[PDB]
Amino acid sequence: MSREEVESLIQEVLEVYPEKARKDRNKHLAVNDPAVTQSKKCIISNKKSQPGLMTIRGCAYAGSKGVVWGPIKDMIHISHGPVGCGQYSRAGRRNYYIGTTGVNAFVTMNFTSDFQEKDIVFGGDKKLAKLIDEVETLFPLNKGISVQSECPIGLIGDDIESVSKVKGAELSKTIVPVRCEGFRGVSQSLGHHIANDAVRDWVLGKRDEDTTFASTPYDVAIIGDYNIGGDAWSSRILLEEMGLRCVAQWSGDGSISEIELTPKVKLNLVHCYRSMNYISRHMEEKYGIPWMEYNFFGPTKTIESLRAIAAKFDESIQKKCEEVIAKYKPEWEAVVAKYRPRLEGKRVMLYIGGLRPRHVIGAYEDLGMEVVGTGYEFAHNDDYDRTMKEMGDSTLLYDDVTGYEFEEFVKRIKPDLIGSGIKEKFIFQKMGIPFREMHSWDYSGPYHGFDGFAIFARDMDMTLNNPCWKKLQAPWE
Amino acid sequence: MSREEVESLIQEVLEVYPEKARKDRNKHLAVNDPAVTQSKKCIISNKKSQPGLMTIRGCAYAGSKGVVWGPIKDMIHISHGPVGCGQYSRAGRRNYYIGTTGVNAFVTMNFTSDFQEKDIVFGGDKKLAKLIDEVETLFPLNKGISVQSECPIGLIGDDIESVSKVKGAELSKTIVPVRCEGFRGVSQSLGHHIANDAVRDWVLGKRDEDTTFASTPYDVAIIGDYNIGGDAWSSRILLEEMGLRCVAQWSGDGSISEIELTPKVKLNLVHCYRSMNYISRHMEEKYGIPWMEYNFFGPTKTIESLRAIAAKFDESIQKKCEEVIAKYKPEWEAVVAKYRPRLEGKRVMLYIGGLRPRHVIGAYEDLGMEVVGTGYEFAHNDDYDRTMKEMGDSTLLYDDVTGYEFEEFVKRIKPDLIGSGIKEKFIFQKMGIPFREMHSWDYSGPYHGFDGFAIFARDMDMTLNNPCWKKLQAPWE
Amino acid sequence: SQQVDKIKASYPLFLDQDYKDMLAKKRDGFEEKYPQDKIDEVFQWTTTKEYQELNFQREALTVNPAKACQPLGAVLCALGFEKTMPYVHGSQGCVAYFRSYFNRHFREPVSCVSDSMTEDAAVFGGQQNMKDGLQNCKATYKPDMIAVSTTCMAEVIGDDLNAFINNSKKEGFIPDEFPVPFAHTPSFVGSHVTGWDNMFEGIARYFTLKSMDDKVVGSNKKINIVPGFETYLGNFRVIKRMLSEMGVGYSLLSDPEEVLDTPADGQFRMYAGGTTQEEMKDAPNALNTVLLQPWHLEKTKKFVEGTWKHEVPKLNIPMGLDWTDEFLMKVSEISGQPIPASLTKERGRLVDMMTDSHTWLHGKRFALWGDPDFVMGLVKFLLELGCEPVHILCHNGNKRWKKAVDAILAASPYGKNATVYIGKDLWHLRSLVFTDKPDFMIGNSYGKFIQRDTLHKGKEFEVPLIRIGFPIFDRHHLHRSTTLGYEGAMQILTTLVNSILERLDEETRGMQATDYNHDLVR
Amino acid sequence: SQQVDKIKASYPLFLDQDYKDMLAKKRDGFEEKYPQDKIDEVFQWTTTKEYQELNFQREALTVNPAKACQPLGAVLCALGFEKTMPYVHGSQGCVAYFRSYFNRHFREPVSCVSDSMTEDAAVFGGQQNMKDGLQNCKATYKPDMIAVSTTCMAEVIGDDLNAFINNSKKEGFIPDEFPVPFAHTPSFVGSHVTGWDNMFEGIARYFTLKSMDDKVVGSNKKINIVPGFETYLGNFRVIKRMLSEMGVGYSLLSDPEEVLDTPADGQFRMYAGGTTQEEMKDAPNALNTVLLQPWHLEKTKKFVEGTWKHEVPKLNIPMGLDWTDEFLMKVSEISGQPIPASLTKERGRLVDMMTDSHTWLHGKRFALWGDPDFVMGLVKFLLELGCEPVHILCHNGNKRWKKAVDAILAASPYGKNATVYIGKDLWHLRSLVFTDKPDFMIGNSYGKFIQRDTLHKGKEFEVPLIRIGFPIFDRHHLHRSTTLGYEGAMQILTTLVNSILERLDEETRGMQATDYNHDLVR
Numbered sequence A, B: 001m002s003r004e005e006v007e008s009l010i011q012e013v014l015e016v017y018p019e020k021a022r023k024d025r026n027k028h029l030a031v032n033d034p035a036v037t038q039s040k041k042c043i044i045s046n047k048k049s050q051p052g053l054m055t056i057r058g059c060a061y062a063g064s065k066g067v068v069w070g071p072i073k074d075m076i077h078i079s080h081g082p083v084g085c086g087q088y089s090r091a092g093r094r095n096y097y098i099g100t101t102g103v104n105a106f107v108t109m110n111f112t113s114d115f116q117e118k119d120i121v122f123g124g125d126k127k128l129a130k131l132i133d134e135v136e137t138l139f140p141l142n143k144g145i146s147v148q149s150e151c152p153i154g155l156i157g158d159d160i161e162s163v164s165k166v167k168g169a170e171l172s173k174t175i176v177p178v179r180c181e182g183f184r185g186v187s188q189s190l191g192h193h194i195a196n197d198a199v200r201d202w203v204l205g206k207r208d209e210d211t212t213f214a215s216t217p218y219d220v221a222i223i224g225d226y227n228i229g230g231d232a233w234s235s236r237i238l239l240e241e242m243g244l245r246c247v248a249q250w251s252g253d254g255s256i257s258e259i260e261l262t263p264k265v266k267l268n269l270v271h272c273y274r275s276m277n278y279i280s281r282h283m284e285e286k287y288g289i290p291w292m293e294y295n296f297f298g299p300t301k302t303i304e305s306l307r308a309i310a311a312k313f314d315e316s317i318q319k320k321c322e323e324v325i326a327k328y329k330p331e332w333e334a335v336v337a338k339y340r341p342r343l344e345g346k347r348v349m350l351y352i353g354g355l356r357p358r359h360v361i362g363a364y365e366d367l368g369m370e371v372v373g374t375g376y377e378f379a380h381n382d383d384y385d386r387t388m389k390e391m392g393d394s395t396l397l398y399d400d401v402t403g404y405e406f407e408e409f410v411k412r413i414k415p416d417l418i419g420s421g422i423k424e425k426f427i428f429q430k431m432g433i434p435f436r437e438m439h440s441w442d443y444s445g446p447y448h449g450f451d452g453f454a455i456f457a458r459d460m461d462m463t464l465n466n467p468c469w470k471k472l473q474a475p476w477e
Numbered sequence C, D: 001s002q003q004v005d006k007i008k009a010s011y012p013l014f015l016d017q018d019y020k021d022m023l024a025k026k027r028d029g030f031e032e033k034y035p036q037d038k039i040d041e042v043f044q045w046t047t048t049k050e051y052q053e054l055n056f057q058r059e060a061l062t063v064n065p066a067k068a069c070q071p072l073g074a075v076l077c078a079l080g081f082e083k084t085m086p087y088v089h090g091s092q093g094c095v096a097y098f099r100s101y102f103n104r105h106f107r108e109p110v111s112c113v114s115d116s117m118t119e120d121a122a123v124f125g126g127q128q129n130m131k132d133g134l135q136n137c138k139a140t141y142k143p144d145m146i147a148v149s150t151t152c153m154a155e156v157i158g159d160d161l162n163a164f165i166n167n168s169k170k171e172g173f174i175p176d177e178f179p180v181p182f183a184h185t186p187s188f189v190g191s192h193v194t195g196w197d198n199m200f201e202g203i204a205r206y207f208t209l210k211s212m213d214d215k216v217v218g219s220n221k222k223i224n225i226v227p228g229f230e231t232y233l234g235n236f237r238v239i240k241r242m243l244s245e246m247g248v249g250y251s252l253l254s255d256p257e258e259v260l261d262t263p264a265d266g267q268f269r270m271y272a273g274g275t276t277q278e279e280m281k282d283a284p285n286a287l288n289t290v291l292l293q294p295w296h297l298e299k300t301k302k303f304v305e306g307t308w309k310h311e312v313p314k315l316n317i318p319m320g321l322d323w324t325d326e327f328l329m330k331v332s333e334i335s336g337q338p339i340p341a342s343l344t345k346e347r348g349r350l351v352d353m354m355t356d357s358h359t360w361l362h363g364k365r366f367a368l369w370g371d372p373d374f375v376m377g378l379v380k381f382l383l384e385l386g387c388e389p390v391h392i393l394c395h396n397g398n399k400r401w402k403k404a405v406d407a408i409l410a411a412s413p414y415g416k417n418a419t420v421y422i423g424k425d426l427w428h429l430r431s432l433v434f435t436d437k438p439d440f441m442i443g444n445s446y447g448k449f450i451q452r453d454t455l456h457k458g459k460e461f462e463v464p465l466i467r468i469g470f471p472i473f474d475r476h477h478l479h480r481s482t483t484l485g486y487e488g489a490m491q492i493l494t495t496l497v498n499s500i501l502e503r504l505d506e507e508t509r510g511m512q513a514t515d516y517n518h519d520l521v522r
C-alpha cells in the first residue's frame, strides 16, 4: 500500500546498518510492480549473507540431506562428520512415509560417523568403510546408502567418492557420495543442486539398459514434492483419479526403485521448481521427457493445474479431469462458504524458502485474503520473476531478510497474519500477531489438493481468530 | 516382656481421661496370658464407644452394605437415604469380582435414593417404589435388589419391608429390605448380624423345594471370604486342587444363585467367623450342614487347614491334599528362604476389625516375626477367646482403641511395623514407623493361600526395609 | 503358583491358566450367568439414544452421584482453624467415612470426633452424648476450639445444639470460656459445599455477632479472604502468594493448608497452622471480605454483609485469565495497592503459553463435572482457550447458577454446542459421552469407570479422563496442585495440552499403520 | 474427500479407504518393497540377543546419538549474560540448527548470529568475516557484549579467534572497550556440555584474569553459583529461591531464565535478565564458587581454583534427598547461615511423599539416559526411592564418571542389577530394553521411537517413555519444570508414581477381563 510509503520504510529500516551492509541489503529489498518481468532490475537474490545480521538461511547439508536425500525411505543416509548436524536435522522435517522404521525404512533415524579428534587428524575414510560394513550387517533390508558430507569432510582431505565406489563394488550396493559440506554455497539451494547431481550420477541411470518395466501413455512422476504432512499423497490421489499412473514421487515417501523408474515416464510433474529443476532439465535432455510446473494450493490453482495436466494427454484424461473437478466442487465450495467470511479482508506477510512464498498466494486469495509482503531465504531471480506477476502492486519484497529487517517491516505494515518458520514464530507471537508455520504447516496439514484446502482454511481461521490474541494487554495497564 | 511394665503403661496412658471415660477404657485394655482362655475375666468387648475419643469403628450400614451385601455382584444394592453413605462406601473395599459392570454386575456402582428434605418430611416409600421401577427399566439383567437403610430411614418410620414385598410380588423379583441404619448397634458387627438375617429371611431358602441341582459328596461352600484382592480365588484354587467342588462363595465374587445353592453343600468352610457365624449356625440347624473355621494365612496355617478339611472327607481327598501340599512346598519354602532373613526378629503391632488381628499371626511367625500387640474394632469375647492362646505372654491387647491410646502404646512399645487401616496409616508413617494396610492389603494382595503368601512376604519386606524410613531425621537436626 | 524371583499380584496373577479355568468353571457351574451374547446386546443398548432418553426420565433413582453430604464440608471448614477439633454430633459411622474419604484424597491424617449417638439417643436425644463427648475430646486431644456439626440422625430427631452446648457449659463439662461454635448441617439438604458454608457461618457468628459494637470497617487495613470448600493446597498457597506480592494485608479465614501438609519428620502433629481466633474476632475490622467461591458461600455472604457491614464484591472465582484479572483489580481497588510488575509478568507468561498451545487446544470438545464454582471457572477458562465445553454437569448446582453459566456460554462462539445439566449424575453423563462423544472428560476419579465403559464400546469411542477436581483417589499427590490464579491456569493448560498430545501419540504409535504421523516435534 | 463440519488432518485422513487403496497400489507397483514376512522376520531378529551382540560390536557406526555438538552449549551459556549476543564464528547452517533446536525445546525466541563463512574463508581464513560480523552485530542488535564460539569449519582451518578479535578492535570495527569474550568450541570434541564449559571459562577469564591484583576472597560475602548446561527454568528458579530462603548472598553466573521466559505482552524483548558484567568482574571476591554440574564443569573448576583461588567444594548435583541435603549443608558452612525451618519443612514434605508412594515405586526397573550430572542425580534419587536402575546410558560420559556411578550403585542393594554404559547410543539402548526389559524409560523425546518399536513387538513388551531431560519436543511447557532440590525431587516423584499408576490403569481397563483390578483407590 502506498508505494512511496513502502520505499520510505525500506530506507528508514536500512539506516541502522553500517555502510557496506546497508549498500548490500538495499539490493535485496524492492517494492513490487506486476508489470515488471525481469526481476534482476529490481531485486537481487542468491548472494552471500551479511555476517552478524541473523539470517534465516541454512546450509548445503540441509538442502541435500534434510531436503532432497533424507526423505528417500528405503535408503540409509549417513551424516558423515561430527555429531551436531545429523542430530539437529533428525526428524525435524515432516516428510511423511509408509514403512517399518529401523527395518526397511530409515527416514527418522540418525546415522552418523560421529567424528572425533582422531578422525579429524588422521582422516575418516577407513572409519567410513567400517561404518558401511556395520550398516550392512545391522540393517540388511536397506536398499542403498548415501553419504552426506558435513563441513570437516571437505575441509580435511577425505575422499568419500573412492570409498563409495570401492565398497559399492565390493558389496554390490548403491553407495551415493554427496559433497554437501555446509560451507559450500550460500544457503540450502546449492545443497539442492549437489543432491540432484548425486541422484543423476549414481541412481537415476541404473536401469538405462533394463526394459522389463511395462509402460503406459499415462505414466507420470511427481518431482519435488516432499510429502510434508502428506501433501504428496493428497496430490497423488487427484492425479490417479484423473486417470494417470504416478510411477514415482520425488522424494517424499520416495523409494530408490521409484527414482530408478522415473526415466520411463511420459511427463514429469514438478512441484518445487527451485529444488528439482536441475534433474527435470537433465531428464528432458537425456530421456526426452517433458516437464511442467503445477500448483495444488487451493481450489483455483488446483483446478487450473489439473486442466493443464489433462490437456497434456488424450481426450479420455480430459473427461476424467472434468469429472474430478465436478466431484470435488461442493467440498471446496462448502469450505469457502464457511471460512471466507471469517478471513475476508485480512492481510498476510510471508517469509519462506524457495517455492512456497509465491505458491500459496492463490489459496489465501481463495479465502479472500491479501498477501501484502513475501520473500525468500534462497530463491533465485527466476523465482522472483514468477513472484512479481503473482504479487500485487506496491507490495513489499525481501530477499534473505534479516531478523531486524523483518521485525521492523512487520511493525510498520502490521499484517493480520504472518507465515514463516520456527525461528520467527515466537518472535511474532510475542509481538501479538498470529503466526502460522509455513514450512511444517504447524504440525498440521496436508495443505495440497482439495482435501488439503479444508485443513488450510481451518488452520488459518483457528489461528487468525483465536481469542488469545485479544488478551496481550493487561486490563490495568 | 515385663507384664508389669505393660500394665504400668496402660495406667499411664489412661491417666489423661476423665473419670468415667478412664473407668470404661480400663476394661478394654489387658495384658495377655495364653493360659487364660476365658477372655471375659480379662478383657471386655462389643460395647458402646466413649463419645469424643476418636474411635475407629464404622456403623451397621458399613457392616451390612459395605461388607456382607455389597460384594454380591449380580444384585443392585440401593443406599436408601441421603447421599453421603453410598458415596463414601462406593468402591472403597476391594471385594474383587468378574463381571460386566453396569450390565450384569453392579458392585462398584452407587445406587441411592438421594434423600432430600421432602423425602424426610413426607416419607420415602413412594420414592422407593418409583426407584425400583426405574432400576428394573435401566438395569434389566440385574438378578435382585437389596435396600440398605441409612439412619433417617429408621428415624422417620419408613416401611421398606412392605414396599419390598409388594414390589417383589409385582415384578417377580427378589427385593431384600435391610434395616441396617447406622445408629443401630455400636459398630459394623450388628451390621453383619442384620445382613445375615436378611440373607436367611429373603434369599437363602428360595430353592428349598427345588431338587434339580446335582450334588456330590465333595460339595463345599466358602463362607465369609470377601475376595479382597482376590483372596477367595487364591483359596478356591487350593480347595479345588484337593478334589472338592466349591458350589458357593460368600460373598466376594458371590452371586445370588450361589447363595441359593448353598443349602445343597456337604460342608461350610467359614473364613470370617465374626461376620458369618450367624448364617453358618442357622444352616447347621435348618439343613444339617456342618461348618468349620479355617485359616489360609501363611504356609503353616494353610497346611493345617487343608489337612483338617481333607480329614472331613474320604481317603481320596486326603491323598489329593497331601499331593497339593507336596506340590506347593518348594514355592513357600523358597519364599521363606528369601524373606525370613530380612524379617527375622522384627516386631509387629496390629489393629483391625474382627478376624484378621488373630488370623494373620501365623503368617507373621512364618517369616520369624513377633506380634507384640493386637486388637479389634468390634470383636466379641469369643474372638478374644480364640485370640489369647495365639498371642505371646505379656503382649498388649486393646479393644476399640482410641487414636490417642494407640499412638501412646506405639510410642512406648516402638514396634518395627504396624498393620491397621487407612485412618492410622499416615499417622504412623509420620512417626517414622513402617505401616501396612491390613484391610485393603495396601492395594496389593491376595494374601490368602500359597500364592498369597509370596505377595505377603514381598510386601512386608518392601515396606519394613524401605530406605525412606531412614531419612526422617534431617542431617542438620 | 508363584515364581520367587518374579512374584505376581492379583493382576496379572489371576490371568494364569489355572485361575482362568477355575473361574470359568465357577461361572459355568454355579453363577447362572446371562449368556455373553445377551450381555453384549444389553451393553450396546445402554450406549444408545433410546437408553439415554430412558435414563434422563429418572425421577427417583440416583446412580453414581457427583456430590457428598454436608458434614464433610463442615469438617473441612473446621480443619482450617488453629488447634480446632472437628466434632460431629451424631453417629460415629459418618465420621469413619469422612476421615477415610479425606485420608484417601489428601494421603494425610484427618482428625475428627463423634459423640457416638445410638438408638438410645434416637429415643431420648443426644444431650448426654454432647456433654460427655465435649469433656472427653477437650481432655484427650487438648484443642483450643471444638467446632460442632451434625449428622442426619441428629437432624431428624431435632437435637438443639445450642441448648446442649450451653447446658454442657453450665454443668461444668467444659469451661464457659471455651469456644464451641456449632452449625446444623443436615445431609438431606444441599451437599458438602453447603456444609462448609454452614460451618463457616457458624464460626464467624460465634466469634463476631455479640461484639460488633466496637468494630470499625477498614480499621485493620486488611481484606478478609474466604476460600470455601477447597481441596487443592496450591490454591490456598497461590492466593496467599499473590496477595503478598501486591503488598496487600489479608486474613485467610479457614486455612487448612498446614494441617493437611505436615512434614514426615518423626512426630505426629495433630494440629498445625490454621486461622487463629484473634483473626476471626478482628475480621469485622477489615476493609472488605472477598469470597473465592461465591456460589456456595451464600449464607456466609448474608452474614458478612448484614452483620459486618462489608460490601462484598461481586467477583467470580479467580480461575483463568479474565477472572484472575478481575480479582486482582478488585483487590487493588479495595486496598489501594497497585498490581506489581511480577504479577503482570506472570500474566504475560500465561498468555505466552496460551499462544504456544492454541493450535492443539482449538475446538477440542470436553465433558466436565464438579462443584459449581470450580465448574464455571473451568468453563470460562476453556472458552478462553478456544475449547468447546459440550457436557457441563454439576450435580449440586441450581437454576440461578445454571443461568449464569448459560450467560457465560452465550458470550463466546465456543459455547454454542454446550449444555448445562444440574441435578444429573455420572450415569447421565455416561449416556451423554456415548451419544454425543467429546474428546475428553475433566473430572474426579469417578470418571475412570466411564472411560472403562467407553473403551468397552471400542477404542474409537473411548473418552480419556483428565483428573481435575475432588476426590482424586487413583493418583498420588495431585492435591498439591493449583487451579486458581495465573499459576493454576498454567498448570491446567499444561495438563490439557499434554493430555491431548499423549492421546495423539498413542493413536499414531502403530508401525507402518498410523506412525506416519508419529512426529518427533509437536 | 473432506466433510466441512469434521475436517480431518493427515491422521486420520490417510486412513480413508481411497488413500489406503492408493498407497497399496503405490507400494505394489513401484516401490519393490520387501515382502511383509521378510520385514516381520528381520524386525523380530533385531529384537534378539544375537542382534544385540552384533549391535554392541559397533566401532565406527553411530545410530541415534544422545548428545549434540559443543557450540550449542556455548550458545546456551552466552544466553545467560545480560544483553549478550551469542556469536558463532563459522558457517551459518550451524546457527540455523542451534536456533531451531532451542526454539523447539523452549518454545521461545533464541537469538544467535554467525559470520557466514563460506568456501572463500576455507583458503583465506575468516578474519574479514569476524571484523564485518562484529561491526554488523553491534550496530544492528545493540548488545552490551558479544560472546564468540566456533563451528567445526573454523576449528579445522585453525582460525585464531584472539588475533581476529584484537585486529577487529585495533582497526576500529568495534570499540576497544567493548567486551568480546571468546572460546574455541570444536564439535569433534566432547559434546554440548563441553561447549558450555568452554564458553563459561572464556567469559570468566576475559572478565577476571587480568584484574586479580585487587581481589580478596570472601570480601563480597557471596557464593558464586555456576549452573552449567541447564534446560529447566525451574532449576535456576529453585536454586535462587533456596539461597534466598537461607539469607545467603549469591551470584548466579550465566542465568538465562529471564530471556527464555519473556511474557507475551505485545513487544519482542530480544534481551532480558542475565548475569551482569559487574557480577562477573566481582566474582573472585566471593567466599567460594559452587558448581552445580561438576562432571562437565572441569575446565571452569581449573580456572576458578587456579586463578580465583576459591576452594571449590566437592559436591554432587543437588538432586534427590541426600544430595540436596549435602548442598544445603555445604552452603550453610560456607556462608555461616543456618538452614531455616522452611527448608526443613520442605524436606519433610518430600519425605512424606516418599513414604506414601513407596509401595508403588519399590522394585520398578528403569532404563535412563542423558547428560552425566543429570543421569547420576537421577540414579541416586531412584536408589533413594527403592527403584532399580537397570540400563544407565550416557553417550557423552567418561570412564571416571562411570566409576563414580558404579560406586553410587554399589552403595545400595537396589543397584545390584544396574549396568552403566558410556559412548553408547539409543540404538544400543533399544537392544537393551528388548533383551532385558525394564518397566519404564526416563529420557528425552528421542525415546518415543524406542517405545514405538517395543510396542511393535507386542503390548506385553512395550516400555513407556517418561520424558525427563533434553530435548523435549513432543510435549508443551515441560521446560518450566524443576529437577533440582526438594521441589524437583517432588516433581520427579509425582511424575514417576503417576506414570506407574497410569500404566496400571491402562492394563486393567478391559471389562470382565482385567478390570477386577481397576481399583478406584490406589
Ligand code: ICS
Residues within 6 Å of the ligand: A063, A067, A093, A188, A226, A228, A272, A274, A275, A352, A353, A354, A355, A356, A357, A438, A439, A440
Ligand atoms: S524443497 Fe525447499 S524452506 Fe522446495 S529447502 Fe525448504 S519442503 Fe521450504 S519453501 Mo522448508 S524450496 Fe520444499 C522447501 Fe520450499 S524444507 Fe521445505 S518448507 S518446497
Ligand code: ICS
Residues within 6 Å of the ligand: B063, B067, B093, B188, B226, B228, B272, B274, B275, B352, B353, B354, B355, B356, B357, B438, B439, B440
Ligand atoms: S468381614 Fe469384617 S474391618 Fe470379617 S467388617 Fe471388616 S474383609 Fe476387617 S478384620 Mo475391614 S471381621 Fe472382613 C473385615 Fe474382618 S471390611 Fe474386612 S478388613 S474378615
Ligand SMILES: [Fe+3]
Residues within 6 Å of the ligand: B426, C106, C107, C108, D352, D353, D356
Ligand atoms: Fe502424606
Ligand SMILES: [Fe+3]
Residues within 6 Å of the ligand: A426, C352, C353, C356, D106, D107, D108
Ligand atoms: Fe513461548
